[PDB]
């Protein structure tokens, strides 16, 4: 109808949730950091030159019910979301882009190319896949331009036969509505594990905060806002209640919280952070039921007639830093495609 | 403690949304901060 992205918004959310869920399942013991939006738009703008069964899995896995939703509309939804994120915020920077990087031989299904520039405002670049160390370069930079040098080495190894790659970033820098005081930031204990305690710098404010505790989610939940059009939500489980929380999470619940601007007096202690996460998503997207593009069954004939292609890598990397003054994060995704 | 002292000294979860679109900008879980 009107700004359309909330047509897709929970579909995103429930994806994030679920992808997340896989990442949890993988190892209880790691820091997880990804960016849903970034992973998603890529597989969205990819879907747009995939046909049949293989198209259907992507969108499927993304948690779109094609029966219920015009595919044509999905793409629209996304066009909007992007658009809007990249709207200029006076106080807060949020920027994303998408690039396609093409072997200069490749003759493209012309419509695929207008599709991606249109709907995903994508950028296109013409490349020699025969200079792997200079292409790999040219790629790494776009991203490292893009995320203001927060991610630099997204592409660690690139294929010798690569036909093209779809690369997509996000960069975010925001400042807390009510930042902390750096004096008050005092090095306190974090119990990682039941045997491991590590010392961390703990930033502290005493004040009037957006916090509560849901018997529901068996946690405390805090929302912290940014000077801008954005907010952070931190979910501190009760003891033993961690997987409990992890499962009970739903977009509804998220939107419920967001309607609250009801504050409470507390003593908040929250660590200062920098963390990364680096993933080869084939596998975990395997789980989410997206498998055909990575195999010999794939159909990227919306892309190019010349030869049957396929995906051979899907690599996400995101990094975050939370300090007193705000947060800055970034994220990037990389898809590579080859002849079968 | 008055007020209540909520300490994020155990592994927690979090996410970043954009207000307008209500889109899940970024999702995370810290388990060990000194695991860079
Ligand atoms: C992922 O998340 C998991 C939570 O679901 C975490 O799991 C927790 O791990 C600890 C590991 O010690 C569990 O500890 C209970 O049991 C131990 C004693 O028994 C095992 O461990 C000790 C060494 O830690 C050994 O000496 C024992 O022999 C036995 O281990 C097995 O031993 C074999 C021979 O040495 C060896 O070859 C095996 O490799 C070895 N392990 C396995 C898996 O086979 C005990 O010391 C703990 O004590 C605490 O709790 C008591 C009860 O509250 C308390 O009285 C005491 O003071 C301590 O606080 C504990 O009883 C633990 O049950 C489990 N779950 C939870 C709820 O914490 C895991 O840490 C995390 N990461 C990873 C990498 O898995
Ligand atoms: C996507 O569409 C399908 C087909 O309508 C829905 O699947 C069935 O929905 C009915 C009503 O909820 C259930 O009784 C069936 O058990 C469903 N089939 C399966 C295999 O689950 C599906 O619910 C739709 N997706 C969403 C998000 O509503
Ligand atoms: C966050 O995004 C909102 C959109 O709701 C921005 O609001 C715009 O504000 C100007 C007036 O300053 C209007 O002319 C626009 O119509 C508004 N909306 C849009 C969609 O452009 C807002 O600037 C942003 N920043 C902050 C500080 O909240």
List gaps in chain A by the residue before each (C–N > 2.5 Å).
Answer: none
Whether residues A37 and B25 touch (CB distance < 8 A) is answered with yes
3-state secondary structure of B4: coil
Q: Which residues pair with A38 in a beta bridge?
A: none
**Do A192 and A198 contact (CB within 8 A), yes or no?**
yes
Superfamily, domain A5-176+272-340: Antithrombin, subunit I, domain 2 (3.30.497.10)
The C-alpha atoms of residue A108 and residue A102 are separated, in whole angstroms, by 9
Distances from the Cα of A131 to the Cα of A34, A99, A337, A339, angstroms: 30, 19, 16, 17
Whether residues B13 and A36 touch (CB distance < 8 A) is answered with no
**Do A16 and A41 contact (CB within 8 A), yes or no?**
no
Centre of ligand 2 from the C-alpha of residue A60, in Å: 13
Helix (H) or strand (E) holding B13: strand B12-18
- Does residue B21's CB lie within 6 angstroms of at least one atom of ligand 3? no
User: How do beta strands B5-7 and A264-271 pair?
Assistant: parallel
**Do A91 and A135 contact (CB within 8 A), yes or no?**
no
The C-alpha atoms of residue A188 and residue A84 are separated, in whole angstroms, by 40
Extract the tokens encoding A74. Answer: 């999905």
Whether residues B35 and A31 touch (CB distance < 8 A) is answered with yes
Closest by CA position to A98, among listed A79, A120, A119, A126: A120
- Does residue A11's CB lie within 6 angstroms of at least one atom of ligand 2? no
Burial of A16 (0-12, 13-18, 19+ CB in 10 A): buried
φ, ψ of residue A168 in degrees (nearest 5): -150, 135
Closest by CA position to A176, among listed A256, A92, A260: A92
Q: Which of A271, A278, A326 to substitute to test the interface with B, most B CBs within 10 Å?
A: A271
Closest by CA position to A268, among listed A332, A214, A324, A328: A324
The C-alpha atoms of residue A186 and residue A271 are separated, in whole angstroms, by 9
The C-alpha atoms of residue A125 and residue A293 are separated, in whole angstroms, by 23
Resolution given for this structure, in angstroms: 3.1
Extract the tokens encoding A263. Answer: 């504050």
Burial of A221 (0-12, 13-18, 19+ CB in 10 A): buried
| Residues composing chain B | 36
The C-alpha atoms of residue A91 and residue A255 are separated, in whole angstroms, by 24
Tally of CB atoms within 10 A around A226 = 24
Asked whether the CA dihedral A302, A307, A313, A319 is positive or negative, the reply is negative
- Does residue B20's CB lie within 6 angstroms of at least one atom of ligand 3? yes
φ, ψ of residue A135 in degrees (nearest 5): -80, -50
| Chain B closest-CA separation from residue A318 CA (Å) | 9
Three-state helix/strand/coil letters over chain A: CCCHHHHCHHHHHHHHHHHHHHHHHHCCCCCEEECHHHHHHHHHHHHCCCCHHHHHHHHHHHCCCCCCCCHHHHHHHHHHHHHHHCCCCCCCEEEEEEEEEEECCCCCCHHHHHHHHHHCCCEEEEECCCCHHHHHHHHHHHHHHHCCCCCCCCCCCCCCCCCEEEEEEEEEEEEECCCCCCCCCEEEEEECCCCCEEEEEEEEEEEEEEEEEECCCCEEEEEEEECCCEEEEEEEECCCCHHHHHHHCCHHHHHHHHHCCCCEEEEEEEECEEEEEEEECHHHHHHCCCCCCCCCCCCCCCCCCCCCEEEEEEEEEEEEEECCCEEEEEEEEEEEEEEC
User: How do beta strands A164-175 and A32-34 pair?
Assistant: unpaired
**Do A144 and A151 contact (CB within 8 A), yes or no?**
yes
Q: Which residue's CA is the closest to the ligand 2 atom numbered 1?
A: A65
| Residues composing chain A | 340
Centre of ligand 1 from the C-alpha of residue A239, in Å: 17
φ, ψ of residue A77 in degrees (nearest 5): -65, -40
Tally of CB atoms within 10 A around A303 = 25
The C-alpha atoms of residue B27 and residue B13 are separated, in whole angstroms, by 8
Residue of B nearest to A201 (CA): B33
Whether residues B26 and A34 touch (CB distance < 8 A) is answered with yes
- Does residue A193's CB lie within 6 angstroms of at least one atom of ligand 1? yes
Phi-psi region of A147 (alpha: psi -120 to 50; beta: other; left: phi over 0): alpha
Closest by CA position to A253, among listed A219, A227, A279: A219
Extract the tokens encoding A97. Answer: 């882009």
Cβ within 8 Å of residue A170, ≥6 positions away = A35, A37, A38, A94, A95, A96, A147, A330, A331, A332, B25, B26
**Do A227 and A175 contact (CB within 8 A), yes or no?**
yes
**Do A176 and A152 contact (CB within 8 A), yes or no?**
no
Maximum distance among all Cα pairs of chain B, rounded to whole angstroms: 38
For chain A, which residues make up each domain, given as ranges?
Answer: 5-176+272-340, 177-271
Extract the tokens encoding A212. Answer: 């509560």
Tally of CB atoms within 10 A around A196 = 12
Extract the tokens encoding A174. Answer: 């925001």
The structure was resolved experimentally with X-ray
In CATH, the number for domain A177-271 is 2.30.39.10
- Does residue A67's CB lie within 6 angstroms of at least one atom of ligand 2? yes
Residue of B nearest to A29 (CA): B31
């Amino acid at each position: 109808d009107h700004p359309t992205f909330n047509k897709i918004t929970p579909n995103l959310a429930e994806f994030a949730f679920s992808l997340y869920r896989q990442l949890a399942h993988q190892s209880n013991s790691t820091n997880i950091f990804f960016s849903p939006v970034s992973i998603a738009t890529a597989f969205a703008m990819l879907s747009l030159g995939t046909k049949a069964d293989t198209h259907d899995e992507i969108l499927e896995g993304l948690n779109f019910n094609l029966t219920e939703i015009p595919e044509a509309q999905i793409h629209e939804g996304f066009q909007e979301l992007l658009r809007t994120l990249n709207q200029p915020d006076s106080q807060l920077q949020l920027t994303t882009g998408n690039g396609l990087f093409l072997s200069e031989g490749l003759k493209l299904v012309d419509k695929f190319l207008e599709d991606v520039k249109k709907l995903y405002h994508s950028e296109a670049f013409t490349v020699n896949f025969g200079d792997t160390e200079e292409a790999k370069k040219q790629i790494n930079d776009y991203v490292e331009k893009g995320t203001q040098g927060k991610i630099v080495d997204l592409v660690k190894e690139l294929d010798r036969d690569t036909v093209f790659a779809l690369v997509n970033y996000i960069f975010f820098k925001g400042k807390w509505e009510r930042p902390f005081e750096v004096k008050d930031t005092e090095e306190e204990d974090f119990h990682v594990d039941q045997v491991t305690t590590v010392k961390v710098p703990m930033m502290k404010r005493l004040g009037m905060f957006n916090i509560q505790h849901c018997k529901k989610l068996s946690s405390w939940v805090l929302l912290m806002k940014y000077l801008g059009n954005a907010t952070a939500i931190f979910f501190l489980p009760d003891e033993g209640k961690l997987q409990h929380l992890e499962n009970e999470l739903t977009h509804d619940i998220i939107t419920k919280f967001l309607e609250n601007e009801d504050r409470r007096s507390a003593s908040l202690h929250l660590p200062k952070l920098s963390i990364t996460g680096t993933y080869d998503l084939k596998s975990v997207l395997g789980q989410l039921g997206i498998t055909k593009v990575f195999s010999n069954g794939a159909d990227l004939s919306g892309v190019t007639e010349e030869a049957p292609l396929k995906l051979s890598k899907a690599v996400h990397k995101a990094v975050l830093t939370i300090d007193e003054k705000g947060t800055e994060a970034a994220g990037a995704m990389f898809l590579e495609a080859i002849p079968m | 403690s008055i007020p209540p002292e909520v300490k994020f000294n155990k592994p927690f979860v979090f996410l970043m949304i954009e207000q307008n679109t209500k889109s899940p900008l970024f999702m995370g879980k810290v388990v060990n901060p000194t695991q860079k």
